Amino acid sequence: XXXXXXXXXXXXXXXXXXXXXXXXXXXXXXXXXXXXXXXXXXXXXXXXXXXXXXXXXXXXXXXXXXXXXXXXXXXXXXXXXXXXXXXXXXXXXXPXXXXXXXXXXX
Amino acid sequence: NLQPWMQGLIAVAVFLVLVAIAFAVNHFWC
Amino acid sequence: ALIDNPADILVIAAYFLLVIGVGLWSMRSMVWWPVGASLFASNIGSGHFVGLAGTGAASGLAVAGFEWNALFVVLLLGWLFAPVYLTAGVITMPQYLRKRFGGRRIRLYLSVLSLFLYIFTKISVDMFSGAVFIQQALGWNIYASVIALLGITMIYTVTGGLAALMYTDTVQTFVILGGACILMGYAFHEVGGYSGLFDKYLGAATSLTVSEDPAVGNISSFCYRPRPDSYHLLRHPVTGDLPWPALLLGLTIVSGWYWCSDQVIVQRCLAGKSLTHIKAGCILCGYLKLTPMFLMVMPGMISRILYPDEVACVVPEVCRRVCGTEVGCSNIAYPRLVVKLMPNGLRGLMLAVMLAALMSSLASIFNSSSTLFTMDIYTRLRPRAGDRELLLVGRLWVVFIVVVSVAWLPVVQAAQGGQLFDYIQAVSSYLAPPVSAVFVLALFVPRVNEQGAFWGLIGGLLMGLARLIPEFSFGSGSCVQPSACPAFLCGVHYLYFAIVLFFCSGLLTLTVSLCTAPIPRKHLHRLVFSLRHSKEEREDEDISEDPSWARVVNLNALLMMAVAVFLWGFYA
Ligand SMILES: OC[C@H]1O[C@H](O)[C@H](O)[C@@H](O)[C@@H]1F
Known part of the structure; x- marks a missing residue:
């Protein structure tokens, strides 16, 4: 059972700033990391998987990076609509586990 | 902790030394 | 079900009509580069695609050392064994052993062994690879796929495909190689380039890892995770699936035998105008034999990344649904890729040219085995036999070997953990x-x-x-x-x-x-x-x-x- 840790519970950025949301896996997942966004009233939506592959339709602002145990999701130009909870999931092994979720506010 | 290209060059150097031996033996005696 | 679109159907039909037309029109001379191309084309078949991509999916790139070993034994062919054949005045290895030892039982034994190797490593392997491609393209079962493959091979051989082969064999193989370059480009684009493959392969596993069968239950991670040494050519001497001492020493024996004794390989090699042309063609063939690492093996690893539930299935009932055998479905690695990464135009062309090369290979091996049985085996049992009797015996022999290879198909499908290349190399x-x-x-x-x-x-x-x-x-x-x-x-x-x-x-x-x-x-x-x-x-x-x-x-x-x-x- 792999533990995904999001060090920062909460991030505040202005509109137009760049934000990096970090995730740390308990072991080396071979970039087998997905990032989900969940806006307040909504269900999670896939942003990234394989730690860098954008899901169909997500903007180029959302860029995933990382390797080994350290992964980041970067929002290059934060819009006022970007406030949400961002979750990292490992798809390296089963069961799938999620990060705690980082709340990006404005 | 060698890079893949370092390992490739090391293998090439060993191969060239081996071929040099196999040519110098003939150059000395068949 | 996947090629059931107008573009793929049109391209497949046009290519098959073209091969039919070329066959109907058909009704020591070579120089160095045709020699090298012919050696590579003769060695490389669709069984190589299926096996190398499947073993790349299942185990990584060490299987590349199976093709990379061939450079040095092709050098042995050009520098040691081709001179022996030319000096002896013989064109085959049985002829050399008949001159070297005399007698008639060594040649008879070698003919029988070649017939068995035709059935096992050539006819059943090609039939299985065609069936796997047809099953991934159309969803047919392996028996319907093999019946369709045999039927199109029959059409192909009754329409003069043997006569057109002498023109189109190497050209067809290198059209397959260009299509494989295109598919390699698409596959590396799917995983994010060359470094994306090595980012992703070790993390690619199936999420279906629990069997409903009480004996199996939860499958251990060792059975469904990629090998920790997947990126390494040289694997552990005792615990490696392809141990490096074995791959370096005992593959030379088996490769030696293939390149320096194979009737087709030696016949292609000895067709060179001179011995310098033979050696230069051997160099060209060896250089070409570095390509299956990137054209078949790495695409197979990419296929494992892209379709881990199918390619890397681990629970027996799931694997049985995916490809038909409970032991694993890595053999679908290259076909699935062709079926799912090629666009609506290139998919049909790639499948059509691969299947036509299959059909040519089958027809060639059918003819060569029938002549071998008739001349080396049957004419010994019946010394004086008529032309009509020899034709009948050759046809009955083709029927017999087809039936035996169809019966051997489940064995080839399941053998070596459902790894075709391991089956061929083990036999x-x-x-x-x-x-x-x-x-x-x-x-x-x-x-x-x-x-x-x-x-x-x-x-x-x-x-x-x-x-x-x-x-x-x-x-x-x-x-x-x-x-x-x-x-x-x-x-x-x-x-x-x-x-x-x-x-x-x-x-x-x-x-x-x-x-x-x-x-x-x-x-x-x-x-x-x-x-x-x-x-x-x-x-x-x-x-x-x-x-x-x-x-x-x-x-x-x-x-x-x-x-x-x-x-x-x-890649060590
Ligand atoms: O059985 C030995 C042979 O196995 C495969 O066909 C390889 O592609 C050849 O290079 C090798 F000679």
Whole structure:
């Protein structure tokens, strides 16, 4: 059972700033990391998987990076609509586990 | 902790030394 | 179901009509580059695509060392064995062994062994690979796929495909290679380039890892995770699935036998205008034999990344649904990729050209095996037989081998954990080492005689069957469901059995030769390596090469070897 840790519970950025949301896996997942966004009233939506592959339709602002145990999701130009909870999931092994979720506010 | 290209060059150097031996033996005696 | 779109259907139909039209029109000369292209084309088949991509998916890139070993044995062919054939005045290895030892039982045994190797490693392998491509393209079962493949092969051979082959064989294979380059481009684009493959492969596993069967239950991570050494050519000598001592020593025996004794490979090699052209073509073929790492193996790893539930299935019922066998479905690696990464135009063309190369290979092996059975086997049992009787016997033999290969299809499908390349290489490792040892001793030990060669071949056959028959009778077992084979009869890698069988059959050859009468010098001139420069007549074709180009071609063999040695160390 792999533990995904999001060090920062909460991030505040202005509109137009760049934000990096970090995730740390308990072991080396071979970039087998997905990032989900969940806006307040909504269900999670896939942003990234394989730690860098954008899901169909997500903007180029959302860029995933990382390797080994350290992964980041970067929002290059934060819009006022970007406030949400961002979750990292490992798809390296089963069961799938999620990060705690980082709340990006404005 | 060698890079893949370092390992490739090391293998090439060993191969060239081996071929040099196999040519110098003939150059000395068949 | 996947090619059921107008573009793919149109391209497949147009290509098949083109092959039919070329067949209907059809109703020492070569130079270096056609020689190299023909050697590569003769070796490379759709079984190579299926097996190399499947083993790349299942285990990583060490299987690339199976093709990369071929550079040095193609050099052996050009520099050691082609001169032996030219000096002896023979075109095949049975002809050399008939001149070298005399008798008629060595040739008869080699013909029987070649017939068995046709059925096992050539006809059933090609039939299975065509069936796998057809099953991934259309969703048909393996038997319907093989019946359709045999039917289109029948259309192809009744329409003169044998006559058109002499024109289109190498060209067809290199059109397949261009299509494989296109598919490699698409596959590397799917995983994010070359470094995306090595980012992703170790993390690619199926999420379906629990079997409803109580005996299996939860499958261990060892059975469904990628190997920790997937990115390494040289794997552990005892725990590696492809141990490096085996891959380096015992693959040379089996590859040696393939390149230096294969009737088609030697016939393509000996068609060169000169010996310099033969050596330069061998260099070209060796250079070409570095490409299956990137055209088949790495695409198979990419296929594991892209379709882990199908390619890397691990629970037996899921695997049975995916491809038909419970032992694993890595063999669908390359077909699935072709079916799912190629666009609506290139998918049909790639499938059509692969299947037409399949059909040509089948027809060629059918014809060659029928002639082998008729001339070397049947005409011995019936010395004087008419033309009509020989035609009837050849047709009945083709029918028989087709039936036997269809019956052998489940075995090929399940064998070696559902890994086709391992099946081919295991059968070759069980049957080839005696022939390799006897051929080497024939060249380099003049004391070896007909008694020694024949009983070395027979003892090697018995020792190799003592492993081959239990390996197939104990069934197919995977990591999930290990077979009952006692693990001293199957736990040693087949390329270690290649070494043991090679040296045991050689030892038997030497022992029997020493306790029997020797063959006088007068029969051995230009047949043994000690007398290759003997102008004396013998009892029972030009080696000269220009010195200026001889040094050029030799340095190009050294350069090619250095390139291959770099690639061995790069991926070590
Ligand atoms: O059985 C030995 C042979 O196995 C495969 O066909 C390889 O692609 C050849 O290079 C090798 F000679």
